[PDB]
């Protein structure tokens, strides 16, 4: 899932 700290991770 897209999370704000992690950018493209799992997104």
């Amino acid at each position, epitope marked *: *899932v897209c*999370n704000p700290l*992690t950018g493209a*991770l*799992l997104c």
Partner: antibody
Amino acid sequence: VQLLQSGPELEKPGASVMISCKASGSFTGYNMNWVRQNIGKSLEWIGAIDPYYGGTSYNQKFKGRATLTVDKSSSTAYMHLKSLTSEDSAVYYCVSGMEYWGQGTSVTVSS
Amino acid sequence: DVVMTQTPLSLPVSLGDQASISCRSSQSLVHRNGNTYLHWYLQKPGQSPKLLIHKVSNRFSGVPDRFSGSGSGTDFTLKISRVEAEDLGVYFCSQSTHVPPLTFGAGTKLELKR
């Protein structure tokens, strides 16, 4: 947000451990990330999991020897760490969206 | 993978001093989408890391005014004005631009001078 990790683990070289991380306070809205803290305090990101859909991304150093899972019935994430060696004697953190950290789980590898 | 070099690695200060920590990455942390996924954590002794600054300069929930993050591209700085005891611990920078893996700086220990 609170992340409750399981207690200390002790294994022989070669073995595996399974550690848990119980989240409280939206379990499915954040990737659950895992990070090792080594003895000299350096940090190494192991991987993360999407808890609604179950997709995973790994640090290639850990790929093939660590497996992330979740249980949505109990908002609990898990890490199965295989192939243990002395370098794995460390503290392992779960981290919700890289924002909030659990208290850590010690793993000690000794014969 | 991105190498995150912090300097100094140990920073002795006096109470009330201004403290400055540098974090340099081996490649740019500005992502194609315009964001710079550079964050700062503090781990106080005996505790877990806690998020201080996200996306270069944004203070997280409850983080005092005396912490500020600056920089761009490959060169970042955390500044801690009016150091007090509760500030002592290990500061880490972290990048989530080039992933996997997320990487971290080695940690800068903020300690007292005598």
